[PDB]
Amino acid sequence: SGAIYVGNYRVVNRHLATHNDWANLVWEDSSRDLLVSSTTAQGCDTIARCDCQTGVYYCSSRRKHYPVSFSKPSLIFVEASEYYPARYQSHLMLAVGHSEPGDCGGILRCQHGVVGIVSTGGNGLVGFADVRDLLWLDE
Length: 139
Ligand SMILES: COc1ccncc1CC(=O)N1C[C@@H](C(N)=O)C[C@@H]2CCCC[C@H]21
Ligand SMILES: [Zn+2]
Description:
Bound molecules: the ligand COc1ccncc1CC(=O)N1C[C@@H](C(N)=O)C[C@@H]2CCCC[C@H]21, zinc ion
Shape: globular
Catalytic activity: Selective cleavage of Tyr-|-Gly bond in the picornavirus polyprotein
Subunit structure: Homodimer.
Protein name: Protease 2A
PDB class: viral protein
Strand order of the largest sheet: 6-5-9-10-11-8-7
Assembly: monomeric
Number of domains: 2
């Protein structure tokens, strides 16, 4: 679990969005596993606007932060699951690191701010849904 709170927006993994997120829907994209809902309170987070390929992410299954080198956002194949058919997930960044399904929502940060959230992984890999291209989150 986890979310980004920026301005009057809440960014979550689309597969973990609650009934309240869908009732306050701003935007969603199944191909990116992202959903953004509106909030009444002002958020605590800053979004990175950069091309960093290193950063640190929070891993709830280890209660620890880990440093990572990750690939640029791209289209990556993800197997079918209970929430999605087998498909290419877009705007995904991979790195070598530990992750389990419940780690989705952990934040990846660089020196500039929030880069994305954990969305996929397996076998010593961790994948992050990028949010740096969503310029409208800042306004
Ligand atoms: C952090 O996730 C890990 C990590 C390790 N092994 C597995 C996973 C879990 C994983 O990759 N997926 C794919 C995800 C997606 N973006 O399509 C969402 C799915 C929700 C239902 C369980 C399967 C999940
Ligand atoms: Zn950066």
